[model samples]
Target: MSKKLIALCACPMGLAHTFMAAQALEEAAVEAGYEVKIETQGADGIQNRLTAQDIAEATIIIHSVAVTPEDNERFESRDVYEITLQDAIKNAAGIIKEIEEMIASEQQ
Candidate 1:
């Protein structure tokens, strides 16, 4: 079975780019052969609520935001990866590939 990956997509406004980022990450995750769940945190609050189980099961956490570390304290001990929203939106597939390679190398 493939590994589980969880991502958090956030923006100051939280409506347009947040959803777009989530879609991008999902597509990338699919291409990378992993299951992905994305949560969006915007002005309206956590739009896609991610449960503790999701975090616990995730092999990696991708954050497409500029939030402080404290905001994502739940993933502090996890392999948290942060990328610019632009890169996450524009080059999601490449990013995913790079992440997969990095994870593989780290496990070696």
Candidate 2:
């Protein structure tokens, strides 16, 4: 129950960009010393799906999509952040670091 982060990576189209963004976010989170899991919404369907327990223990929720998430309600009471799929693909590490800095500053 320390901290966890969950993310939704979707493009509403092809599978390539969605998965690319997912990989990037995952790499960034790990380098930042944070544990994170990512769900990918590709042309076929959702992958690495989220569970109720994942949402409960998560300190952050991020969505990189053009449309609303399939189960958006699951994160109703949680802190959520967003970026477009292309942005994530281009600079996912920066986004993660920005969030990290924000969270650290919030405690002061």
Candidate 3:
């Protein structure tokens, strides 16, 4: 199966918070039986950049950001679930559960 969730994590400083949310989301997504990819925009620049193929294969997009992303155009076709970095780090499992429920209902 293709990746079920795609995540973009960024912060103004592009340091700790950015990676924390990505890690949280990654762990939560995997625990929920979904494959996930997280592209991080940090002081080091965007890491693990998402390809067009990745966008094509992903079912949903999640943006945990404090600053606007430069590559917003890439995910224009996807329905983005925007959340705060704090929310992502603190409650990623809850967020994933919500998205999972939404997807499940959409398939019904």
Which candidate gets the maximum TM-score versus the true structure? 3
Candidate 1: residue 92 lDDT (0-100): 79
As for candidate 2, its clashing pairs are none
Better of 1 and 2 by TM-score: 2
Off by over 4 Å in 1: 69-71
Candidate 2: residue 74 lDDT (0-100): 79
Lowest summed lDDT window (length 10), candidate 1: 65-74
Please, what is the whole-model Cα lDDT of each candidate in the order they appear?
A: 0.80, 0.80, 0.84
Candidate 3 error regions (>4 Å): 1-3
Q: Which ranking of candidates, highest lDDT first?
A: 3, 2, 1
Better of 1 and 3 by TM-score: 3
- After aligning candidate 2 to the native by TM-score, how far in Å is the CA of 37 from where it should be? 0.5
lDDT tens digits, residue span 14-108, model 3:
76778899999999999878678989887768886888877777777888888888887888777889888778999999998898888889899
Q: Relative to the unseen true structure, what is the C-alpha lDDT of residue 30 in candidate 2, on a scale of 0 to 100? A: 83
lDDT of 1 by residue, 1-108 (tens): 668988888787655777888899889999888889988887766767678889998987888885542258888877788887667789878778888899899789
Kindly provide the TM-score of model 3 when superposed on the true structure, using C-alpha atoms: 0.91
- Per-residue error for 50 in candidate 1, Å, reads 1.2
